Structure 1
Amino acid sequence: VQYSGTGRRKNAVARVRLVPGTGKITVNKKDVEEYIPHADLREVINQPFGVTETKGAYDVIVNVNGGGYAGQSGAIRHGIARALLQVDPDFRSALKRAGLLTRDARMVERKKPGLKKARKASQFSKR
C-alpha cells in the first residue's frame, strides 16, 4: 500500500507517495538533504507532519520535476498534504487551517511591453 499525491508550485510539479516508515524522505531517487540543501526548505516540506501529528510515521517517495529547488519544495509540501488527506480525511481540518491544502497560485507575472519587467518602467526624465 502506497498513498499517492500531487503538488504544484510555480513551474514545479511533484508526484508524492507516502509509504509508512520512519519519516525518511527521498525525492527523485535522492534524499531530501542531498536534493534540497536548504534547511528552511526542508522544514517547509516537513510542515504537514507537524500539523497532523504524524511525525516520522511515514516515509515519502516524491517524483518532482520543473522549477527551482524552492518551488519544488513548495510543490513537495502540497503533494504531501494531499497524500495525508488520502490516508485520513480527518486530517482535513488541521491541514486546511494550516493552509497546506491551499494551492499557492502566485506565478511569474508576464513582462509587459514597453516595461522592462512585469512592472519596472524605463527611467523617466521630465525634460
Structure 2
Amino acid sequence: QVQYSGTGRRKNAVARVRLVPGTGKITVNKKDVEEYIPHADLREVINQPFGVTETKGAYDVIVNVNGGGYAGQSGAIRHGIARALLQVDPDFRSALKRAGLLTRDARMVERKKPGLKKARKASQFSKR
C-alpha cells in the first residue's frame, strides 16, 4: 500500500502525517475537517502548498496531533504538507522555498523571569 510520513513541530506538538492519495480530507484523531475543528480551518492557512504543487490536488490526510489549541496544531499542518512535498517533488522544492513554506517557527513559550509578573510584564510602578 501507499502512504506517507511527514512530521511537524509547532507550539509543542509533534504531528505525524500519514498522507495517502485521495481527494483532500483529514482524519485528525480519525475525525474529519470539522468533526474536530471549528470554522477556523481556513483555505490559505491549511491548503497553502497545494496552490504551488499538485494544483489543485488534493490527497487525503491521516494525522494524530495534540498540543496547542485549534489554531496552534493547525500550524503543524503546513509542516506535514512541506515534508510530504519534500518526499514527492524535488523540482517544486525551489518554488516551495522561494515561497518560504519550510521555515520552522522556533518560538515556544517565553521564559518567565522572577522579580516581575510575567516574561516581560513588569509590575505597576506605583510611584506616587
> 1:13 & 1:81 partners in 2: Cα distance?
14
TM-score (structure 1 length as normaliser): 0.88
Given that residues 115 and 122 in structure 1 are in contact (C-alpha distance below 8 angstroms), is that contact kept between their aligned partners in structure 2?
yes
Alpha-carbon shift at residue 125 of structure 1 (Å): 2.5
CA distance in 2, matches of 1:45, 1:56: 13
5+ residue gaps, structure 2: none
User: Using a 3 Å threshold, how does the CA distance of structure 1 residues 67 and 13 change in structure 2: closer, same or farther?
Assistant: same
Provide the C-alpha distance between the structure 1 equivalents of 2:102 and 2:77, rounded to a whole number of angstroms.
Answer: 12
Q: Is the 8 A contact 2:40 2:70 kept in 1?
A: no
CA RMSD in angstroms, aligned pairs only: 1.7
> What is the distance in 2 between the residues matched to 1:26 and 1:48?
19
Q: Give the conservation status (yes or no) of the 8 Å contact 2:24–2:57.
A: yes
Where do 5+ consecutive residues of structure 1 fail to align?
none
CA 1:53–1:30: 2 relative to 1, 3 Å: same
Kindly state the Cα deviation for residue 91 of structure 1 after the two structures are TM-superposed: 2.3
User: What's the offset of the Cα at 1:40?
Assistant: 4.7
Q: Give the count of matched residue pairs.
A: 127
Distance 1:40 1:2, change over 3 A: closer
Higher helix share: 1
Query: Structure 1 or 2: larger strand share?
Result: 1
The 1:6–1:67 alpha-carbon spacing in structure 2 relative to 1, beyond 3 Å, is same
Decide whether the 8 Å contact of 2:96 with 2:102 is kept in 1: yes
Shift of the 78–30 alpha-carbon distance from structure 1 to 2, 3 Å rule, reads: same
Q: Tell me the distance in 1 between the aligned counterparts of 2:127 and 2:96.
A: 53
Q: Using a 3 Å threshold, how does the CA distance of structure 1 residues 98 and 35 change in structure 2: closer, same or farther?
A: farther
Residue 42 (structure 1) shift: 5.5
CA contact (8 A) 1:65 1:72 kept: yes
Per-residue CA deviation, residues 45-87 of structure 1 (Å, 9 max, x unaligned), is 2112122143233111112122222110001211121111101
Task: Name 2:47's counterpart in structure 1.
Answer: 46
CA distance in 1, matches of 2:30, 2:115: 44
Counterpart of 2:78 in 1: which secondary structure? helix
Superposition deviation, residue 124 in structure 1:
0.4
Q: Deviations over 1:11-39 (max 9, x none)?
A: 12210122111112221100122222133
